[PDB]
Amino acid sequence: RRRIILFPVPFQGHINPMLQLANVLYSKGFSITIFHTNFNKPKTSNYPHFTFRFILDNDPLAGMRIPIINEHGADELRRELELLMLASEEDEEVSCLITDALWYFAQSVADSLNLRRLVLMTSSLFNFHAHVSLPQFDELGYLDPDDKTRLEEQASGFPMLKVKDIQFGFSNWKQGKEIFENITKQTKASSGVIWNSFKELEESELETVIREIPAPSFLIPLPKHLTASSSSLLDHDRTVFPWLDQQPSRSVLYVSFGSATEVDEKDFLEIARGLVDSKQSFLWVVRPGFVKGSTWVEPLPDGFLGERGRIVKWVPQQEVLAHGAIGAFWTHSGWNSTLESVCEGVPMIFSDFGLDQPLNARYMSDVLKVGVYLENGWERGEIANAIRRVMVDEEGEYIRQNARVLKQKADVSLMKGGSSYESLESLVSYISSL
């Protein structure tokens, strides 16, 4: 009997994957302790088989906890580790810790303890290519936002990307590679690295991973394993499932934009019209506090759709995406939502609110070819001409085709004698054989 220590980052896009992995690992035999701040704590009654430890705070702007924890957490993380290693019975040794990547400082703490740390990568191999070649991007001044980026113009080497992708996708040059420097470092210094993906999804970046990571990396599509429904930090309105049933097959555009994202009153209305203008049935989730200078959706006028679509606060998305009523998904190019998509097999409109969303958008658009990327902000014509495109237009059947070829591949992964299948037997072997 052997304990894994997991340690998410307490934001939905990190919780979601980290606990899915937790569930898959309990399956295969391991005791499971979870480190988590008291901030954004998930519902624990949902996870009766996991032991939970709250730390670091036992008495978009919220994402500063990450850097604040990194520098000031070390000595608190080490304490609780040692506690847990101590109290552990003769017959329940801790095999390993498994953190988010952004916990780049656990590796010193673990190092200091001699415990070995594995890493959960909540974004893609491509993402991690980007960060690897960042000192290559400083040179060309892609990280410089003073002058300009060239028009639909390829960066360097084998540029599946463009300079905008990086420009906006690394639009925190104000802080700079100071952070990402270590994340990449602290990924490579690791005893292993679990990728939320499968082998056909990113086969070009395998090399990038097998080059830079001396430790074995293991390729694991979590959504295909199990749904992340019971780590939702917000309450699901399930009143959408009885509806969808009464939409005809593939006539609903799902529309989620992350768990953090904010928009102006101007754009929210803009986003609004485009959806009507497209003349399609669409379920559109809107967080509580999504629109700025408002609480929920006061900005919405009366007499917009009403029959075709309905707004909601929050839903169990994977469960949604898997409904036939679904035809596409207006993502924000967050990775889980993006990955969920491929695995349930739905084509997507893209967007980017920085960080990683262009990167994701880019090589989901062009490489795989499973979506349409509004590069150029928000126009009520374009948006409707992306949605019509993917959904109705006869000029996106190659989008719809590819978006479901890739799904069968995923099932094949998890079918015995398949990448993901073997990767999990291996990961499992890699945890035990320690």
The domain limits of the chain are 2-134+170-229+417-432, 234-393
| Technique of determination | X-ray
Q: How far apart are CA 402 and CA 422, in angstroms?
A: 25
Resolution of the coordinates in A?
2.8
Query: Residues 373, 362: contact at Cβ < 8 Å?
Result: yes
Q: How far apart are CA 7 and CA 43, in angstroms?
A: 16
3-state secondary structure of 96: strand
Q: Spell out where the chain is interrupted, by the residue before each break (C to N > 2.5 A).
A: 59
Residue with tokens 């506690």: 83
Query: Residues 198, 117: contact at Cβ < 8 Å?
Result: no
> Is the CATH number 3.40.50.2000 carried by domain 2-134+170-229+417-432?
yes
CATH architecture under which domain 234-393 falls: 3-Layer(aba) Sandwich (3.40)
Q: How far apart are CA 358 and CA 365, in angstroms?
A: 10
Question: Do the two domains 2-134+170-229+417-432 and 234-393 of this chain adopt the same fold?
Answer: yes
- Read off the amino acid at residue 221: P
Query: Residues 187, 101: contact at Cβ < 8 Å?
Result: yes
Active site positions, annotated: 14, 100
Q: Kindly state the DSSP code that residue 364 receives in the 8-state scheme.
A: I
194 backbone φψ class: left, alpha, beta (φ>0; ψ -120 to 50): beta
